């Protein structure tokens, strides 16, 4: 009785969701898409290599103009790159060298960073003094900072290692809402194209869909076996991809509320560090611990290429907003633009 | 190129100059990771989000990083050594300290990182076994018929009962360390106290031997 009684109600409700998910599975997405021509053999070559970081690169982000790019490393320095002329626009020294994430404002006036210091620091790129100064420090997260993504010049959302995600207001500096429900540490985050929702995978092998305005969880997806290290959102906004430590990518659908595809191979045994889609959503670029990235046919679950140019762990991965290039960072202190 | 893009590249080149002035200044320091429990006396071995303490011995700079499973332990993949502090006085929590040591030794990312083990509070261990009132045998059944201290060098003035207990606890942590690893990393066990000032020398000597046997290995001298 009591909690145990409530335990029977929780188990009964869990079976109802599973029964409803099984009812809608009239056909498999892989079975349905067995009528389209394959994407062929994707062959990408590293156009440029960005040098200057002196330790492992942990995060990277593309500007909305698809030309500027920010990266963070364990030196304690943020470098903004001109991805066309391999020029260093800025070099922002950080107070703490233990930084695991970095972001770029959609307007382009700000960058964010955070890590083991449990603080998201926001830097003003465009100041009258000609330098880069820190604008605000967002404190209130108990654990480390795993991800941070801007919604606009005043709103950012941070996922933390205290099993929570938070929405901040930079003008006030205070936490507006908090997103609770994850059991393990949240490791990734992905804002929807319409920005009204976002998704976050955690170490409890689950991914939750949140509503930013309401502030509570909408759907919960459980198909993985280990910690979900990376998450990314489909360009349409009705699906997302999860990359976990069990050497497998998965594709979940928001409307169907069910898993759609599994991206696995028997000769891959290492974890997945980063995932990203393409402009059309047909490709799925995912970095691994075996020092190279894989290109997956997102509709056919077949490999289509290998981005083998790094001699250490590929830690970050990003695709431009026009789909022209793929930037790949790794623990060998090198960033490579692929095309 | 144009006169504006030529001047932009001159600014970029100056950035790489500053990226190497401080980058070359951080290659002469050794970064250590401090691990342990709350009752271990973790932050009292060296008397000098994430905390950091700096100390220098024999003109060598040391950076000790104390935080506060461990998903952030992969950030310390390139540290010189791991410092694990154990409270050997109490035996109720000695079993969870051994399982504490097992996860770090058999970690996937720390397979090449050596561990300097400080069995802290050895003063209260002597009082707990001389005045008795407790029996490791209760918590560790092997100590009931534990081999007497294996013939070896003991510390002068220590009682035979104290040296029997000290050698038993130190043997548990080296049994885990020698079971696996295949010689890629070595555990260095020490016995400290709360009024011991020599723990800076011991870290210096252990890191000197840590670097020496991997310099000889990657140069294929041994």
């Amino acid at each position: 009785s009591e909690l145990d009684q409530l335990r029977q109600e929780a188990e009964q409700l869990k079976n109802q969701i599973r029964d409803a998910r099984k009812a809608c599975a009239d056909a498999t997405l892989s079975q349905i898409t067995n009528n389209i021509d394959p994407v062929g053999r994707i062959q990408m070559r590293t156009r440029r290599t960005l040098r200057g970081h002196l330790a492992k690169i942990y995060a990277m982000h593309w500007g909305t103009d698809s030309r500027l790019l920010v990266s963070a490393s364990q030196d304690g320095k943020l470098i903004i790159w001109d991805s066309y002329t391999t020029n260093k626009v800025h070099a922002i020294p950080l107070r703490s060298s233990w930084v695991m994430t970095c972001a770029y404002a959609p307007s382009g006036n700000y960058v964010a960073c955070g890590g083991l210091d449990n603080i998201c620091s926001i830097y003003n790129l465009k100041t009258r003094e000609g330098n880069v100064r820190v604008s605000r420090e967002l404190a209130g997260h108990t654990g480390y900072l795993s991800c941070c993504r801007f919604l606009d010049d005043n709103q950012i959302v941070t996922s933390s290692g205290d099993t929570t995600c938070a929405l901040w207001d930079i003008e006030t500096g205070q936490q507006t809402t908090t997103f609770t429900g994850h059991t393990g540490d949240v490791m990734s985050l992905s804002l929807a194209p319409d920005t009204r929702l976002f998704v976050s995978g955690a170490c409890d092998a689950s991914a939750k869909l949140w509503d930013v305005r309401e502030g509570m969880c909408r759907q919960t997806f459980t198909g993985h076996e280990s910690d979900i290290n990376a998450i990314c959102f489909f360009p349409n906004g009705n699906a997302f991809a999860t990359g976990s430590d069990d050497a497998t990518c998965r594709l979940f659908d928001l409307r169907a509320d069910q898993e759609l595809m599994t991206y696995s191979h028997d000769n891959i045994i290492c974890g997945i560090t980063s995932v990203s889609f393409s402009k059309s959503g047909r490709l799925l670029l995912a970095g691994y611990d075996d020092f190279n990235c894989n290109v997956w046919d997102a509709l056919k679950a077949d490999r289509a290429g290998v981005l083998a140019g790094h001699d250490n762990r590929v830690s970050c991965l990003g695709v431009t907003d026009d789909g022209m290039a793929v930037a790949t960072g790794s623990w060998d202190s090198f960033l490579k633009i692929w095309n | 190129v144009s006169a504006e893009d030529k001047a932009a590249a001159e600014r970029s080149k100056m950035i790489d100059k500053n990226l190497r002035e401080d980058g070359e200044k951080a290659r002469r320091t050794l970064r250590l990771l401090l691990l342990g429990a709350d009752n271990s006396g973790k932050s009292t071995i060296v008397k000098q989000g994430i905390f950091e303490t700096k100390f220098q011995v024999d003109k060598v700079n040391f950076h000790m990083f104390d935080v506060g499973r461990r998903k952030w332990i992969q950030c310390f993949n390139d540290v010189t050594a791991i410092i694990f502090v154990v409270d050997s006085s109490d035996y109720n929590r000695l079993q969870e300290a051994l399982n504490d040591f097992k996860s770090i030794w058999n970690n996937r990312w720390l397979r090449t990182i050596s561990v300097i083990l400080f069995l802290n509070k050895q003063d209260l261990l002597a009082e707990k076994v001389l005045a008795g009132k407790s029996k490791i045998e209760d918590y560790f059944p092997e100590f009931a018929r534990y081999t007497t201290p294996e013939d070896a060098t003991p510390e002068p003035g220590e009682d035979p009962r104290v040296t029997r207990a000290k050698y038993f606890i130190r043997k548990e942590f080296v049994d885990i360390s020698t079971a696996s690893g295949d010689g890629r990393h070595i555990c260095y066990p020490h016995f400290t106290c709360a009024v011991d000032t020599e723990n800076a020398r011991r870290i210096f000597n252990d890191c000197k031997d840590i670097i020496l046997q991997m310099n000889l290995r990657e140069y294929n001298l041994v």
């Epitope: 030309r67 020029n87 626009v89 003094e129 330098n131 | 504006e4 893009d5 600014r11």
Partner: single-chain antibody, 233 residues
Framework: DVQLVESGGGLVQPGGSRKLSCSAS????????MHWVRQAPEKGLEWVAY????????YYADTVKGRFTISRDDPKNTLFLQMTSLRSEDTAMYYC??????????????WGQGTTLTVSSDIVMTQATSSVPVTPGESVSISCRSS???????????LYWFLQRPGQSPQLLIY???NLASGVPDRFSGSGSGTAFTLTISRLEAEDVGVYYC?????????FGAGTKLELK
């Protein structure tokens, strides 16, 4: 906050030597390239010299090369212009202009006040209009012409617009022929193409009068336009 305080100047004899210094405060002086621009008493602006960040690159006008020298003192937050073998054609007012060069930066933001010196294969910029009467509240367009195509192979058209109010140092309003500077309202709009440019002002309010200078930044030396004065009715 930002200030470029000038020093020196005055009446000097011809054939002598004078040193001009411009003191900088309120910004990171070490990361800004600096320029010297003079204004004749009955003419427009004229670029003189240029020193980069770290003094790694120096450019001179062909009319001052060999007798003028530009240097900067980063720890002291000041720069100097050594002027030797003066003549009667150097009587002008010398401005110190800061300029920073990276992707998306706007050079020629802040112009200091001038020092009144009283000595007792180039792209030309052509502005046919020189004096135009403009009624308040109306809209006018001021054009400029070039002898060479300012559009580069990277897609950047290096044309700049400045406004010298009567009795004040000129200020940048449009840089690279399309981008509005910070603090300049949306009233000003710049547009053009290769060897053809214009500056459109809509709903001309007060304090919009003065002289408008077009400038090229495609190659050194940088040449200014003659100017287009605006007068009240």
């Amino acid at each position: 906050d930002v200030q470029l305080v000038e020093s020196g100047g005055g009446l000097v004899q011809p054939g002598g030597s004078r040193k001009l210094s411009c003191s900088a405060s309120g910004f990171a002086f070490s990361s800004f390239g600096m320029h010297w621009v003079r204004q004749a008493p009955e003419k427009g602006l004229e670029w003189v010299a240029y020193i980069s960040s770290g003094s790694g690159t120096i450019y001179y006008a062909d009319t001052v090369k060999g007798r003028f020298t530009i240097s900067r003192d980063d720890p002291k937050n000041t720069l100097f212009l050594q002027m030797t073998s003066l003549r009667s054609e150097d009587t002008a007012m010398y401005y110190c202009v800061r300029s920073i060069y990276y992707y998306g930066s706007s050079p020629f933001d802040f112009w200091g006040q001038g020092t009144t010196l009283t000595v007792s294969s180039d792209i030309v910029m052509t502005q046919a209009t020189s004096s135009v009467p403009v009624t308040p509240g109306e809209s006018v367009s001021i054009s400029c012409r070039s002898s060479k195509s300012l559009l580069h192979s990277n897609g950047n058209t290096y044309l700049y617009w400045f406004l010298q109010r009567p009795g004040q140092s000129p200020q940048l309003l449009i840089y690279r022929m399309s981008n509005l500077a910070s603090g300049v309202p949306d009233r000003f709009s710049g547009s053009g193409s290769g060897t053809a440019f214009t500056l459109t002002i809509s709903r001309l309010e007060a304090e919009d009068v003065g002289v408008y200078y077009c400038m090229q930044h495609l190659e050194y030396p940088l040449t200014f336009g003659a100017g287009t004065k605006l007068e009240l009715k």
